Amino acid sequence: MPSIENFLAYDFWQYDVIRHLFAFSTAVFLAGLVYFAMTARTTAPNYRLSANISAVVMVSAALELGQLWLLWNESFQWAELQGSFVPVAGERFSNGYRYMNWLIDVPMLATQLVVVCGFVGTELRNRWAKLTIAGVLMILTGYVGQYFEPAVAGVPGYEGAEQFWIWGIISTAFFVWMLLILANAVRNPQGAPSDEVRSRLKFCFWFLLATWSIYPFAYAMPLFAPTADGVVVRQVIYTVADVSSKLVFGVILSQVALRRSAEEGFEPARVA
Ligand SMILES: CCCCCCCCCCCCO[C@@H]1O[C@H](CO)[C@@H](O[C@H]2O[C@H](CO)[C@@H](O)[C@H](O)[C@H]2O)[C@H](O)[C@H]1O
Ligand SMILES: CCCCCCCCCCCCO[C@@H]1O[C@H](CO)[C@@H](O[C@H]2O[C@H](CO)[C@@H](O)[C@H](O)[C@H]2O)[C@H](O)[C@H]1O
Ligand SMILES: *C\C=C(C)/C=C/C=C(C)/C=C/C1=C(C)CCCC1(C)C
């Protein structure tokens, strides 16, 4: 079933704000790719994997928000006689472009926190394995559940609303599992860090937990407000969540990684 954004007319400001957000997010991810590519060799080789993974994530999200911007521009046209941005015949906007590209974004964002946490070798591969399974089995189940928003909103002709509150509470259980795997990864760092680095890693985990909880709130948006205003607020708290959980988290984790590298022995990290 299509998105709830295809059953709502928009004002000029309502359409313009959403397309400005889609342009701004892909611009800031394209800039963050340049940033994480430039300042990648300033960290030690043992935490440079987390620096390369950040650039991989910036590749992944700029190739998601650009497609969302393209599909937002194609699926709607201006109707002058109503003063509205009505849809077009033939094209329908989809919010699954987010969920398809989160499958690379979420396990790498958790893995790069485990890397700065100091887990190497078999332990890194074993904590990546659990996190990838738990983040594939939650993102795909959210992707099934987000196909029932015309049903859960109340659009006539689109039934089957019971499958919206099932594949969200299913994806919640694996999200709790991911938070647990990251929690006992940040409670026991490896490599004997300092008491400031431990607080920074705990702050990294709590920041990830706070910026990842916005996504179940934006998921339930066509149950709270299935209106164009609700769609605008949903895209605002999607842009804020995207930037906070991928670029801001990357800059905070690179600061913790540089602190660890400059603490152990790295002169490029000490002079920076
Ligand atoms: C969108 C345009 C481009 C945006 C670019 C900017 C991205 C963000 C830059 C980094 C800013 C945040 O940087 C982060 O700040 C918090 C502020 O509480 C610091 O955190 C500090 O306070 C917290 C309070 O809970 C303590 O737990 C922590 O031990 C302490 O260091 C982090 O050590 C620092 O890494
Ligand atoms: C536009 C998308 C990309 C934006 C990224 C740029 C960050 C701009 C916001 C800066 C926030 C202030 O917080 C500050 O962050 C920078 C960058 O992490 C940290 O800077 C640290 O790493 C940089 C990069 O290797 C070094 O040049 C610097 O000497 C070092 O201290 C500071 O220790 C911290 O105090
Ligand atoms: C942009 C990268 C990030 C941080 C993506 C994260 C996505 C989630 C944490 C989503 C979680 C969901 C839950 C727990 C509820 C069901 C639907 C979602 C998939 C949105």
Author numbering: 1 to 245, 246A, 247 to 272
Paper text:
We demonstrate the capabilities of our method by studying the dynamics of the rhodopsin ErNaR (Erythrobacter sp. HL-111), which upon light activation, pumps sodium ions from the cytoplasm across the bacterial membrane to the ouside. ErNaR belongs to a recently identified subgroup of the NDQ rhodopsins, which feature an additional glutamic acid residue close to the retinal Schiff base, allowing ErNaR to efficiently pump sodium ions even at acidic pH. Uncovering the structural dynamics of ErNaR therefore promises to shed light on the sodium pumping mechanism of this subgroup.
We remove monomers that are not undergoing the photocycle with 3D classification, which then allows us to obtain a 2.8 Å and 3.3 Å reconstruction for the K2 and O2 state, respectively, and build molecular models. At 107 μs after photoactivation, we observe the K2 state. The chromophore has been switched from the all-trans configuration present in the dark state to the 13-cis configuration, a movement that is accompanied by small rotations of the aromatic sidechains in the retinal binding pocket. Moreover, in the adjacent active center, a disruption of the tight hydrogen bond network occurs that characterizes the dark state. In particular, the densities for the side chains of Glu64 and Asp105 suggest increased flexibility. In the dark state, these sidechains are strongly connected through a short hydrogen bond, which has been suggested to provide the structural basis for allowing ErNaR to efficiently pump sodium even at acidic pH. Here, this hydrogen bond appears to have been disrupted, along with the hydrogen bond between the retinal Schiff base and Asp105. We propose that these conformational changes are related to priming of the active center for the translocation of sodium.
